Symmetry: C2
Subunit: 301 residues, 2 copies
C-alpha cells in the first residue's frame, strides 16, 4: 500500500487506551503527515500573562489514534520517522518540585523562546541548533488506560532523543490495529530532561507505518542510521537499565548463536547504557549497540 493522509491535531487523545476509537484507518506501508499540539496544547504562547495556570488536564495531547490494518496483538508496528518540522517558537518550563533541581526553586516558570534560522535563542548569548525529536509516541497497551505522560511497554512519554528524523521505532502491538498516537515534539532536549521540559513546540511529523509479523518485542526499540537501542521504563533508572539490557540480551539469545557469556562481555564493551529522561513518574533508559554488530550477528528487524 502506498497512500498518504494528513491527520490534523484536532484528532487527539490524552491517555493511551484500547478504548479510544481510531481517528483514521490506514494500511501497512501508508504514510501520514501528523500535526501535533505542543505538550501544553498551545496554551502558553502569549509569553506574557501566559502563566502555567493552564487547564493541566490538557497536557500531552497525542494526535491519533491511528488504526493500522493487519496489526494484531503480538505483531510489531514499525514507524519510520521521515520528517519533523517544528514551529517558529517554543516554551521552556520548570519550577518548585519539577525535575532534578525542583528542590532549589519556588513557584512555576515558563519562558517562550524564538526559534530562528534553525537555532533556539535561549538568551542573548546562546543560539542552540535544533535537534527535533518526538517525546510521546506509542500504541495502546493491552489493558486499562495510561495517561500520555506515563511511558510503558507500549511507548508513550519516553522523551528519548534518538526518536528523531531518520529513526525507526518498533513497538510491540497489544491490540488490533495497534492504535498509534504521537505528540510532545521538542525542538531541542538533552538526555535526562532534568529541568522537566525540552523546548516544547507544535509541529508536523511525516512518518510511515508498517506491520511486522515475525517478531516478538517486550518493549520499544529505536533504530537510527548508526545504533539500535532497546528502551525501557521503570520506577528507578536502575531497574529501567536492567530491563533494557535484558531485552537486548534476549534479542541476542533468539536471533544469534552467541553464548550468554559472549553476550554479556560483548555488551560490556560495545554497548552503552544511556538515559532518556529522569523526571516523569516512571524513568526511561535505553541500551544501545552499533548497527554493524547486530548485522554481523544476523539480527534484522
Amino acid at each position: 500500500s502506498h497512500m498518504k493522509y494528513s491527520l490534523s491535531a484536532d484528532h487527539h487523545i490524552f491517555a493511551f487506551s484500547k478504548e479510544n476509537k481510531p481517528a483514521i484507518s490506514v494500511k501497512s506501508g501508508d504514510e501520514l503527515e501528523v500535526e501535533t499540539m505542543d505538550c501544553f496544547s498551545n496554551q502558553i504562547q502569549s509569553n506574557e500573562d501566559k502563566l502555567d495556570e493552564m487547564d493541566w488536564n490538557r497536557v500531552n495531547p497525542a494526535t491519533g489514534p491511528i488504526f493500522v490494518e493487519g496489526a494484531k496483538e503480538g505483531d510489531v508496528l514499525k514507524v519510520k520517522i521521515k520528517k519533523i518540522e517544528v514551529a517558529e517558537k517554543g516554551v521552556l518550563a520548570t519550577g518548585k518540585g519539577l525535575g532534578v533541581l525542583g528542590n532549589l526553586m519556588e513557584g512555576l516558570y515558563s519562558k517562550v523562546v524564538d526559534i530562528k534560522d534553525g537555532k533556539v535563542i535561549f538568551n542573548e548569548k546562546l543560539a542552540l541548533p535544533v535537534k527535533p525529536m518526538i517525546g510521546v509516541i506509542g500504541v495502546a497497551p493491552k489493558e486499562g488506560s495510561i495517561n500520555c505522560g506515563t511511558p510503558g511497554s507500549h511507548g508513550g512519554n519516553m522523551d528519548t532523543t534518538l526518536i528523531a528524523e531518520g529513526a525507526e521505532v518498533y513497538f510491540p502491538v497489544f491490540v488490533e490495529g495497534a492504535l498509534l498516537a504521537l505528540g510532545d515534539l521538542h525542538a531541542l532536549m538533552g538526555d535526562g530532561e532534568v529541568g522537566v521540559s525540552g523546548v516544547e513546540v507544535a509541529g508536523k511529523v511525516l512518518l510511515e507505518v508498517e506491520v511486522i509479523k515475525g517478531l516478538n518485542l517486550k518493549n520499544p526499540v529505536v533504530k537510527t542510521a548508526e545504533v539500535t537501542a532497546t528502551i525501557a521504563s521503570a520506577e528507578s533508572l536502575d531497574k529501567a537499565v536492567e530491563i533494557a539490557v535484558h531485552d537486548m540480551a534476549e534479542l541476542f539469545k533468539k536471533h544469534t548463536d552467541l553464548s550468554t557469556e559472549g553476550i554479556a562481555t560483548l555488551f560490556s564493551i560495545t554497548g552503552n547504557a544511556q538515559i532518556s529522561q529522569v523526571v516523569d513518574p516512571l524513568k526511561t533508559a535505553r541500551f544501545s549497540l552499533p548497527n554493524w554488530i547486530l548485522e554481523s550477528y544476523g539480527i534484522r528487524f
Copy 2:
C-alpha cells in the same frame, strides 16, 4: 616545574587512604609516565588453567600514590591524560551474579583476548577498535580508607569512558599533597560496563598534574575536547544522576548570574545525563555540557 618522572607498577595501593605513604613527590606542572597492572594484578595471563580463583584482595591495584607539592585540602588537582598505552593482551570477565545479566549465567567466565593492529580481537568474527581509558583514578579521601573498587567524591573506580587521552580530570583535594593513584586500564568498555568488566589490560599512562587554587569542587569533573561533565557515585543511578546535576548547577550558580530556572531549563535542553557504570559497589553517572556553553559564561577551571 617541568620535570618528567616514570613511576613503576611496583608502587601501588589497594585502597585510597590518607595513610598510604607517597611513592614519589612531584610539583605542579610535572609529568609522569605511570605503569599499571590490570584490575587483576595481572593474575590471568592465559586461559585454560588461569580462571577466577586468584588472590582477590589483589584486585584493582592502583599505581601511586603521587604526592603533589602545593596541593592543599580544598584545592583542586587537575590531571591531564596525554597518552594511554595498553598491553597486547587483555581479559574479559563475567559470570553468575556479575553485572546486569548476572542472573542469567552459572559459574565464572574469563576470556583472554589478543589486542593487535589497534583492535580487540573479541573472536574470530569480530575485531573492535581500541578506545583506551582509565577505570580507577583518584586522590585520598578526607578520612576513612576506601577500597580501590569503590568510587566516591575522591574518584576511585568510576569506570568512566570519558577518561582517555585528550581529557582532563579535576579532583577535589581532601589531604595535603592530594595523593593521586591510577590503574584499571581498559582497552575498550561501553558505558554502564554491564557484563561487569572492560577489556582489562595493563599499560602505561602519560599524565601531567596541576594544583588549582580558588576552585571549590565536591566531586570530580572530566573535561574532554568537546564536553565537560560532573561525575558522581551513589547506591543508585537515580541518586548518582541527581548529585551530578546538582554539582553542575552549583558550578553555574557560583560562576554565573544565571537564575536557577535559567540553569534548570538550560540543563534540560543542552545537558546530557549519562551513565558510567552500573555494576560496581556504587553506580557512577555523569552530567555533561558542551564546552562552548561553559565557555560563553566564562566558566574555566
